């Protein structure tokens, strides 16, 4: 038995982008995925409504451009044997700072910490804990990057192991990378 968890964010619809890539939408079939963890910056209810069609359980934290000011700034969600922390990440300066993310890991008391904002995918183990940034699922521009690849993450959780899949749109084709993490 497994849990599938979709991890995505920084869509920036409607200001920076118009929609998810068509090839991504074709992959996200309703009913398949159990949980959605969204780093924020949807930035409107239209994208929230779309996420609700995909899974029964949708968790979203507040980004710096979200129009829904009621989203929580951070969240901790338990899926199977894993506690997962979620924050958008504009609060961390310098952006993506490893020492700050590791402090948040300890303070949230989580096995996996998910953050966004940078629009650059990351998935790595650091001091026996796992860190994910799904990137921007629409490939939305930012101020500090010259190339943003549309990206999202799927976690496949099985007992004390998670297999993290990253999906990227490169050219017009979907390509993937796979990273395994086991709790210590």
């Amino acid at each position: 038995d497994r849990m599938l968890v979709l991890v995505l964010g920084d869509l920036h619809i409607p200001h920076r982008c118009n929609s998810l890539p068509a090839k991504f939408k074709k992959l996200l079939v309703p009913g398949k995925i159990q949980h959605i963890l969204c780093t924020g910056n949807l930035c409107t209810k239209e994208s929230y409504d779309y996420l609700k069609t995909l899974a029964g359980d949708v968790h979203i934290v507040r980004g710096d451009f979200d129009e829904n000011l009621n989203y929580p700034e951070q969240k901790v969600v338990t899926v199977g044997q894993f506690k997962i922390g979620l924050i958008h990440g504009h609060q961390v300066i310098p952006w993506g700072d490893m020492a700050s993310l590791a402090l948040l890991q300890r303070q949230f008391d989580v096995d996996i910490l998910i953050s966004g904002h940078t629009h650059k995918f990351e998935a790595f183990e650091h001091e026996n804990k796992f860190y994910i940034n799904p990137g921007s699922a629409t490939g939305a521009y930012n101020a500090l990057e010259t190339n943003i690849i549309p990206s999202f993450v799927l976690m496949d959780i099985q007992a004390s192991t998670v297999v993290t899949y990253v999906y990227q749109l490169i050219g017009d084709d979907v390509k993937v990378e796979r990273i395994e993490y086991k709790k210590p």
Binding site: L28, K32, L154, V166, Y167, I170, K175
Partner: peptide, 16 residues
């Protein structure tokens, strides 16, 4: 080269 991965959402070439 021709490396591909199975995933729960389908089978795809490797990014790198």
């Amino acid at each position: 080269x021709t490396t591909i991965y199975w995933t729960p959402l389908g089978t795809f070439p490797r990014i790198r």
